[PDB]
């Protein structure tokens, strides 16, 4: 029962989806600015371009990246939340419209509850959910170790976005809760730094394990 | 009254041969001719398996027979008919004539 | 005016649900036949069950007793062309099982392929049993 003023929407200014602005959005993390693109656009849709060039993903809008991360099926070959999540025909794969709608409704709910800019909230969530330290196997002399290595911002972004989307999928699996409400809850919790956020929990866990085996 | 002539063939050189012959036939005299008009090329495709047995990975040969098609309209004058019908067609080309 | 448990012939159906779906608790009535019967009777198939009058229940029972006389074409009934009478009919909970049983029993009696397969408990129609149909 969507009203017509929202079914047939026509933007006037150049904003994200015609509703939300960016010129007031700030980024404090000095390591993530050059990779969080906030250029004014209406349609956050790039038709596969920028993927062949190594560093081309920095020219993609952050909202489009969130949409593409959300356009998933779940955890297929690994376990998340304690279960496999294989839908395989009930999945929104190769369907960007449904992801568009999910993100739209999520941003609406965020605006309603917080009464702030949902893009600002997403930026805060990313910054608070991005990890700084990881592990890896390094060999010297002929034996195997487990060392502590730093992380690049272009990878921190991927980690954060993936974790947010996975938390949403978990919270939506087999429950009266919807994918949009789950995404909104996850983003708000990650922005407010609450332990009930999958992304923040994973960040803390990774950093702890690295500080341990460093 | 006009006459239409359709040419089909696998060889393009014979097609060009006959078409330029009739083009000179129609330019010597002053007569209106349209074309030659190229029609879509038609392909007979046949995919089949190589091995005469069932063992081994499967591999496929794809054969094709191509047919090119030209159309011509000649305005159907007596002199044109006379000096057109007298052209030896290369055996690798089929030609069919008829008046509208 | 709400009956949490309504007593239609032989069966007790839920009230919180719509009538077209409550009537499916009976054996022999699907959603489609239920919609047919409710439309013939003149009842809203989206109404909550339990908002049913004795008059309504009686009309439903009569239609079930014999639907073809109240409309209900001969091609929308479970047992068209009865073996021993013709007389297109629609059987419900009690008589449906007896009909199945007597069909199978006459097959077994005349000793036909389908009856032998029924006895042995094996696929009857056309299936292959090498790789599947394993208990």
């Amino acid at each position: 029962a969507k009203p017509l003023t929202e079914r047939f929407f026509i933007p006037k200014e150049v904003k994200v989806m015609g509703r939300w602005s960016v010129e007031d959005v700030t980024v404090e993390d000095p390591s993530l600015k050059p990779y969080i693109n906030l250029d004014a656009r209406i349609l956050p849709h790039s038709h596969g371009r920028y993927a062949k060039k190594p560093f081309g993903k920095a020219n993609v809008h952050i909202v489009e990246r969130l949409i593409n991360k959300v356009m998933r099926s779940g955890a297929s070959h690994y376990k998340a939340g304690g279960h496999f999540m294989r839908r395989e025909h009930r999945s929104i794969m190769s369907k960007k419209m449904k992801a568009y709608e999910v993100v739209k409704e999520a941003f609406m709910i965020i605006e309603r509850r917080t009464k702030q800019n949902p893009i600002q909230v997403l930026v805060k969530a990313i910054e608070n959910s991005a990890p700084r330290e990881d592990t890896t196997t390094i060999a010297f002399g002929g034996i195997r170790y487990h060392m502590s290595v730093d992380v690049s911002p272009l990878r921190r972004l991927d980690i954060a976005l993936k974790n947010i989307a996975l938390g949403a999928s978990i919270k939506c699996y087999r429950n009266k809760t919807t994918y949009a409400q789950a995404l909104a809850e996850e983003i708000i919790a990650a922005a407010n730094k609450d332990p009930k956020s999958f992304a923040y929990s994973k960040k803390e866990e990774i950093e702890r394990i690295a500080q341990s085996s460093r | 009254q006009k006459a239409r002539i359709k040419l089909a063939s696998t060889n393009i050189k014979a097609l060009n041969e006959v078409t330029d012959q009739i083009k000179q036939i129609a330019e010597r005299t002053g007569v209106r001719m349209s074309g030659p008009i190229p029609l879509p090329t038609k392909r007979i495709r046949i995919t089949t398996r190589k091995s005469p047995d069932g063992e081994g990975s499967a591999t496929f040969d794809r054969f094709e027979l191509r047919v090119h098609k030209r159309l011509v309209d000649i305005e159907a004058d007596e002199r044109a008919m006379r000096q057109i019908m007298r052209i030896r067609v290369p055996e690798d080309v089929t030609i069919e004539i008829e008046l509208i | 005016n709400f009956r949490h448990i309504v007593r239609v012939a032989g069966v007790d159906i839920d009230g919180h649900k719509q009538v077209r779906w409550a009537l499916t608790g009976i054996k022999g009535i699907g959603i489609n036949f239920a919609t047919m019967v409710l439309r013939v009777a003149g009842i809203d198939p989206f109404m909550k069950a339990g908002y049913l009058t004795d008059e309504q229940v009686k009309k439903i029972e009569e239609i079930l007793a014999d639907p073809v006389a109240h409309g209900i074409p001969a091609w929308a009934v479970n047992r068209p062309k009865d073996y021993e009478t013709g007389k297109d009919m629609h059987l419900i909970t009690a008589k449906l099982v007896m009909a199945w049983r007597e069909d199978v029993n006459r097959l077994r009696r005349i000793r036909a392929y389908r009856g032998i397969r029924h006895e042995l408990g094996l696929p009857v129609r056309g299936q292959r049993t090498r790789s599947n149909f394993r208990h």
Partner: protein, 133 residues
């Protein structure tokens, strides 16, 4: 006067006709303000919102599109409309703004489908049945 322009996408071909008028835009006889879904409506209307009312309120565009799915049709119409507006205005500021926003408005996309190959020909060129003995 009148101008005609074209645009192409994967198996989709659009042709647009522009002249002077009030600001009506029609794709396959129907207005653009009620095109569905939203994600194609915005795709088609981005160039007009870029140019502005002070240019679009003096022209009438009609587009005829054929082939290749609704998103592809929308993108082809977008390309054709941008090219037609640029050729009608003969202004360089608009062309520069378009090239900065997205160079594929005026330039086209050169991506088609790869033919399929014989292991699982139905699925794709690089896809094949598994081996899990």
């Amino acid at each position: 006067r009148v101008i005609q322009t074209a645009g192409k996408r994967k198996t989709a071909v659009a042709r647009a006709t522009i002249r002077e008028g009030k600001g009506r835009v029609r794709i396959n006889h129907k207005p653009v303000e009620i095109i569905e879904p939203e994600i194609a409506r915005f795709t088609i209307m981005e160039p007009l919102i870029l140019a502005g009312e002070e240019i679009v309120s003096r022209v009438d565009i009609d587009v005829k599109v054929e082939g290749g799915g609704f998103m592809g049709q929308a993108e082809a119409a977008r390309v054709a409309i941008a090219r037609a507006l640029v050729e009608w205005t003969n202004d360089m500021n608009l062309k520069e703004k378009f090239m900065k926003y997205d160079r594929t408005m005026l330039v086209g996309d050169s991506r088609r489908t790869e033919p399929h190959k014989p292991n699982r020909s139905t699925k794709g060129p690089r896809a094949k049945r598994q081996k899990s003995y």
